[PDB]
């Protein structure tokens, strides 16, 4: 009904999740933790290069934050066991620091008073992952879950539809992805990912992403049938997937369009979108759907070998689904 949420990590996702929460009445952010002074969090919230100025009022009082007349407890604990979430009545924690993606590390929020935790990234251990449009129904009361990755949220719903209707024998996917915080402005160090340390604005950078393989986990029926890679390009936000699949049942492109459009207007409304316009990436900046099929962009070699294209706002879509998952596990 009215779920109290605590955000750990006020980075890109933390902040977009925060903004999306203002527009929902069933969820309230009541606390934020990060290694930042309240006055600086206020700044990061008020102004955003990609999504413009915060629609609302934000002031600082007594080292805490006041957003639209509500107190938000601001803390700067490095170790999550000290967060004392129960003091501000937190039901669920959105773990968004990118550092606690295992059960033992995330479990600390529960030790600190929170009832459940939602990792805003794919889990490094086998913490179960949930993707709206793919397997929310599979949630089974676990107290710690993952909302997977932004790319998986784009791919899973589309793949599910395609597979349910025509059967995916095998597929390879590519995502042309926007630049992110892990990259560098100019050629710099990235010991675990050499290419990733190259100047982001000057290059097309190949990168790895198990996101395609991870679909196998949220959609068991596709386990071992998909995999892929990514190219990081110089745009600040919004990415796109290029799924190339081989189908069991023959289907004309017109039939595929109809299948997706049906899903978008029906069962997967709000998750999977459909467009026939001449769109470009900026047209999805701010998009809430996690996957928006681009009918005109895709191409079919034949009734059984097709290349499908779907857009996604890697910050906004995912952030909204984090909230959707929080709401879902709180039923
Ligand atoms: Cl806003
Ligand atoms: Cl999983
Ligand atoms: Cl679902
Ligand atoms: Cl469901
Ligand atoms: Na709210």
Numbering used by the authors: 1 to 331
Task: List passages from the publication reporting this PDB structure.
We provide crystallographic evidence that acP can bind to substrate and co-factor binding sites and that acP-dependent acetylation of key lysine residues of the central metabolic enzymes triosephosphate isomerase (TpiA) and glyceraldehyde-3-phosphate dehydrogenase (GapA) could alter their function. We used a high-throughput peptide array technology to determine if acP-dependent acetylation of susceptible lysines could occur in a non-enzymatic manner and x-ray crystallography to both confirm acP-dependent lysine acetylation of specific proteins and to examine the molecular environment of susceptible lysines. Taken together, these crystallographic results confirm the hypothesis that acP can acetylate lysine residues in the absence of an acetyltransferase.
The enzyme crystallized with four tetramers in the asymmetric unit and had either NAD+ or pyrophosphate bound in the NAD+-binding site. Not all molecules in the asymmetric unit had the same residues modified or ligands bound (for more information). Front and back views of the protein are shown and NAD+ (shown with sticks) is bound at the active site pocket. Phosphate is present in the non-acetylated form and binds in the same location as the acetyl group of the acetylated residue. One major consequence of overflow metabolism is the conversion of acCoA to acP, accumulation of which would cause acetylation of the glycolytic enzymes that convert carbon to acCoA and thus to acP.
